[PDB]
Design a binder for these strands. Structure first.
Ligand code: NA
Length: 741
DNA sequence: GGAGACACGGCCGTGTCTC
């Protein structure tokens, strides 16, 4: 199968490289006659020759329009006549782009920002990750003692053969390979990768830590960090605001971005994520404990176990998600490296671009939400279930032909009109998106049929994934319509789908209350929470599953709902803000928790203690008491200043800042005194009492003296503690005035 | 090419997630 595409430059000409795994072997095929191009709409076709004369400079090399060919395409369901302009190198596009548009005869340009290797996949009809090839995979993690200043203590890895650890101190455990030095540890890990020859290297946050650290130690220790199959090092790319790492010939599959896009929980640690997916706790050994262990030589077995489990948990996490991302890559028609790192929004973009090319539909340029909100029931509810609405929206798009090319169409015999908002949509022909959405579902059902028929357990799990991948993709179109940088953006399309949704949501809530006796506690654009007052947990589950079968029978065709989970209890504050606890006593908040370094520990600690009293123990009055004592204690100067420190990172040169927050005020005073302030530096400040802007009163905690300085009790009460609990407790009829001392 | 989900200090710009 096709694993990735890139290009290389030979004699100024782009050469496409197609990385493949066919018949068990890894091979790189090449293509030398694929040409970059853009499109251009001209006011006057006579001017194409002068447009062909437009030049530009690229590293002092002359860039020009090599060829021009007139082409008839369709733009948003209407014929359009543009000029396809060819070039020599893909790097010519951004050098000459704007001069072609700046030309007075050229109205605009189209398909001018499509990466060359992706353009290739689309145009040649190539689908990555397709077919029957078992890919070999290896997980790995590191343990480290300025970035990459200290040495790497351990490198763990895991696969089918098991999970081992490489360290440079003698640890008597069977899975621990003991090596002489850190350099030889890294070198030993390089051998194992080249020897196992995996197709996929799995990591957790390897884009922003593992690889980069490994680079800088190998940079310092004089090792050439070769993981690429052709002999290259890992390339650290830049994805706008963040970094990312490719390994040529292999697929670096970082689990972190995938997981955040897939599931929803407050803290995205390796243990939390593993606990949410596999329902088993994992011990976390902290960085203060590791240094202590490595320094003395006391507890290196526990540190070595933690590193081994890190590798093993990552591999089995890798085994769960990769097949799904594999399938999404086949549907979208882009590499797993890209699809694994994209937003749901951009997954729909690349799907639509590929389909646009197949139907000869010219792509619109980039520019470069909202929904149902029932006010929830108040207080703490026993035995809650969540049912998902998202499945409604694709069928709504399909049935009502909702598309930008069908919006307010001129001169049709049939129209479906949206409720409330009143937008119209043509019915004489099927829209671009709706017909594509229709086929995604028709394919999903055809997959489900063949799924049940086939009994090969491995292919029964493979076809299960394919169907699941179509669901994630189909469920993304609704959101994509209102996506900010969306090519096929249409606010009317979204409002309309929302409007038509209300009916089915209303009807669903109506049925579940009357025919089944539930009370809906919270309902939003995505789903709703519900219970049966006075009922046992098992009844609720049983009755909920009975409702699912009923409602999906009544809602025509592919109109569906899903049963997501049961929760022992919860409360509900406002839109997208609630908290729940499952039968395993695992708390799950949305839009409430504040577990971040820019909030003080006292605020974090008190909130967590409040969520515990309410959810695990069911004592709201104890939660109120907790906050009362804390606010009393803050004002009496009994809370340790260590719990009051705010950590905040400066992210570029101090001169760049257009607006000064507290941490930028603290940093600028340090810089005025010569003290090192670089991007990445972390200001840890505390707020002293008195007058002035918070920034004027804030000092560094290093410069803090408990005896001399007096922190700002009012600030930590009113701006930190109370804001973190007020909202939660407001859903129980408690106001700020009830919480202060 | 290159997310999003959503806060608060100060007069929307900026930061946090992971490691
Ligand atoms: Na122009």
């Amino acid at each position: 199968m096709i694993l990735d595409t890139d290009y290389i430059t030979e004699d100024g000409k782009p050469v496409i490289r197609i990385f493949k795994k066919e018949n068990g072997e890894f091979k790189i095929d090449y293509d030398r006659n694929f040409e970059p191009y853009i499109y251009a709409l001209l006011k006057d076709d006579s001017a194409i020759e002068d447009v062909k004369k437009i030049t530009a400079e690229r590293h002092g090399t002359t860039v020009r329009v090599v060829r021009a060919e007139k082409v008839k395409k369709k733009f948003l369901g209407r014929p359009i006549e543009v000029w396809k302009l060819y070039f020599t190198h893909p790097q010519d596009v951004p050098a000459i782009r704007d001069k072609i548009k700046e030309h007075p005869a050229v109205v605009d340009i189209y398909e001018y920002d499509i990466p060359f290797a992706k353009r290739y996949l689309i145009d040649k009809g190539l689908i990555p990750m397709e077919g029957d090839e078992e890919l070999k995979m290896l997980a790995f993690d590191i343990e480290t003692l300025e970035f990459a200043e200290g040495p790497i203590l351990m490198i763990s890895y895991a696969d089918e053969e098991g999970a081992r650890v490489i360290t440079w101190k003698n640890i008597d455990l069977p899975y621990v390979d003991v090596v002489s030095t850190e350099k030889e540890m890294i070198k030993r890990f390089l051998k194992v990768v080249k020897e196992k020859d995996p197709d996929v290297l799995i990591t957790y946050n390897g884009d922003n830590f593992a690889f980069a650290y490994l680079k800088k130690r190998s940079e310092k220790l004089g090792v050439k960090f070769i993981l690429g199959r052709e002999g290259s090092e890992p390339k650290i790319q830049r994805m706008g605001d963040r970094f990312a790492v490719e390994v040529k010939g292999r697929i670096h599959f970082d689990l972190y971005p995938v997981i955040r896009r897939t599931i929803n929980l407050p803290t995205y640690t390796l243990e939390a994520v593993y606990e949410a997916i596999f329902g088993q706790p994992k011990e976390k050994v902290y960085a203060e404990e590791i240094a202590q262990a490595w320094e003395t030589g006391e507890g290196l077995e526990r540190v070595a176990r933690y590193s081994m489990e890190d590798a093993k948990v990552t591999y089995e996490l890798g085994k769960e998600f990769f097949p799904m991302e594999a399938q999404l890559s086949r549907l979208v028609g882009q590499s797993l490296w890209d699809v694994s790192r994209s937003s749901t929004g951009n997954l729909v973009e690349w799907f639509l671009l590929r389909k646009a090319y197949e139907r000869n539909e010219l792509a619109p340029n980039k520019p470069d939400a909202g929904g149902y909100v029932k006010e929830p029931e108040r207080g703490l509810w026993e035995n809650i279930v969540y049912l998902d609405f998202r499945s409604l929206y694709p069928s709504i798009i399909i049935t009502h032909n909702v598309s930008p090319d069908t919006l307010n169409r001129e001169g049709c015999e049939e129209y479906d009109v949206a409720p409330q908002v009143g937008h119209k949509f043509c019915k004489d022909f099927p829209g671009f998106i709706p017909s594509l959405l229709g086929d995604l579902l028709e394919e999903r059902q055809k997959v489900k049929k063949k799924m049940k028929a086939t009994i090969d357990p491995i292919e029964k799990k493979l076809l299960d994934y394919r169907q699941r991948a179509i669901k994630i993709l189909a469920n993304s179109f609704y959101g994509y319509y209102g996506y900010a940088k969306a090519r096929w953006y249409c606010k009317e399309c979204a409002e309309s789908v929302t409007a038509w949704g209300r009916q089915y949501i209303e009807t669903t809530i109506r049925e579940i209350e009357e025919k089944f006796g539930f009370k809906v506690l919270y309902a939003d654009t995505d789903g709703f929470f519900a219970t049966i007052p006075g009922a046992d947990a098992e009844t609720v589950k049983k009755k909920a599953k009975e409702f699912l079968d009923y409602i999906n029978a009544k809602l025509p065709g592919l109109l569906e709902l899903e049963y997501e989970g049961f929760y022992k209890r919860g409360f509900f504050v406002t839109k997208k803000k609630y908290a729940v606890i499952d039968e395993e006593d695992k708390i799950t908040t949305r839009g409430l928790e504040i577990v971040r370094r820019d909030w003080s520990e006292i605020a974090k600690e008190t909130q967590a203690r409040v969520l515990e009293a309410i959810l695990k123990h069911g004592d709201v009055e104890e939660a109120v008491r907790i906050v009362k004592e804390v606010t009393e204690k803050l004002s009496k100067y009994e809370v340790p200043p260590e719990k009051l420190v705010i950590y905040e990172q400066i992210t570029r040169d101090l001169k760049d800042y257009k607006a000064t927050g507290p941490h930028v005020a603290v940093a600028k005073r340090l810089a005025a005194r010569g003290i090192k302030i670089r991007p990445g530096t972390v200001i840890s400040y505390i707020v002293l009492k008195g007058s002035g802007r918070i920034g004027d009163r804030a000092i560094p905690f290093d410069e803090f003296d408990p005896a001399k300085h007096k922190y700002d009790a009012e600030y930590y009460i009113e701006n930190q503690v109370l804001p973190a609990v007020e909202r939660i407790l407001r859903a129980f009829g408690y106001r700020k005035e009830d919480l202060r001392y």
